[PDB]
Design a protein around this ligand. Structure first.
Ligand SMILES: c1ccc2[nH]c(-c3cscn3)nc2c1
Ligand SMILES: [Co+2]
Ligand SMILES: [Co+2]
Ligand SMILES: [Co+2]
Ligand SMILES: [Co+2]
Ligand code: NA
Length: 262
């Protein structure tokens, strides 16, 4: 559009964003060696539907068959939960949740390391999260999204890693994937000035190796071409008069929910 949310709209996004975040806090103790991604997905859907009184935006959307996306190791994104896929020590696992409540969407993802961490896994997860946080700290009215993507890329590359090009952040509200596209790297194509009341996600995908990615024969599951590890974190935000408010913050986040400039 780009769609500006009213205060009422924003309050409903606060509620959907909290619910999405709560799914991620809930699922954590279940993420252990020997659990399958299929069970994790069931637990999440059961929780969203029967405790939260909400629904998964994933389920049925363009025919997607499950309720969350679960992406392990070299899978970059859109991993499909499966009863036969079991987690094991050292795995890094992204769970991407999107909840609809009262017509509004809340979208967020985080990494989990399973059992005994490996050093590359810990590092990649930490740097990815730090790249999301740096971008969040830049959001305010007047800024251009190009600057934010540029800053993500500079940081990630300086840390020896690479930024997935083909996937980005997005506006969100009564629609799951709204304008604008929120690129996580510098592009001359990008020119979006932020205004208060915009709501969008930042969701960098970072590869320990080379940025290149291959989609699977299923035209969907995405892996890293060099089979390097890939990590992602995502938050949903609203642009405020002097900053942003994070709508999907968790107790384990180490960034304030409200960021203020001046
Ligand atoms: C579940 C179902 C359909 C989904 N379509 C998206 C998507 C489009 S651009 C970035 N993400 N993600 C999905 C997750
Ligand atoms: Co997606
Ligand atoms: Co998401
Ligand atoms: Co998203
Ligand atoms: Co360490
Ligand atoms: Na991954």
């Amino acid at each position: 559009a780009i769609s500006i949310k009213t205060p009422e709209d924003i309050e409903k996004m606060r509620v959907a964003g909290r619910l999405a975040a709560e799914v991620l806090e809930m699922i954590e103790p279940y993420v252990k060696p020997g659990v399958s991604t299929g069970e994790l997905d069931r637990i999440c859907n059961d929780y969203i539907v029967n405790e939260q009184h909400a629904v998964s935006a994933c389920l049925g959307y363009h025919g997607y068959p499950k309720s969350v996306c679960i992406s392990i190791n070299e899978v970059v994104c859109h991993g499909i939960p499966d009863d036969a896929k079991l987690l094991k020590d050292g795995d890094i696992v992204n769970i991407d949740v999107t909840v609809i409540k009262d017509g509004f969407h809340g979208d967020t993802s985080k990494m989990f390391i399973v059992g005994k961490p490996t050093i590359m896994g810990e590092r990649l997860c930490r740097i990815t999260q730090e790249s999301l946080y740096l971008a969040l700290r830049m959001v305010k009215p007047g800024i251009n999204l190009r600057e934010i993507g540029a800053a993500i890329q500079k940081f990630v590359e300086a840390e020896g890693f690479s930024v997935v090009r083909e996937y980005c952040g997005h506006g969100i509200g009564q629609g799951f994937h709204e304008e604008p596209q929120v690129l996580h790297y510098d592009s001359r194509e990008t020119n979006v000035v932020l205004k208060p009341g915009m709501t969008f996600t930042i969701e960098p995908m970072v590869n320990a190796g080379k940025k290149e990615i291959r989609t699977m024969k299923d035209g969907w599951t995405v892996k890293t071409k060099d089979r390097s590890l890939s990590a992602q974190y995502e938050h949903t935000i609203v642009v405020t008069d002097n900053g942003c408010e994070i709508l999907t913050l968790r107790k384990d986040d180490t960034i304030p929910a409200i960021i203020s400039h001046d």
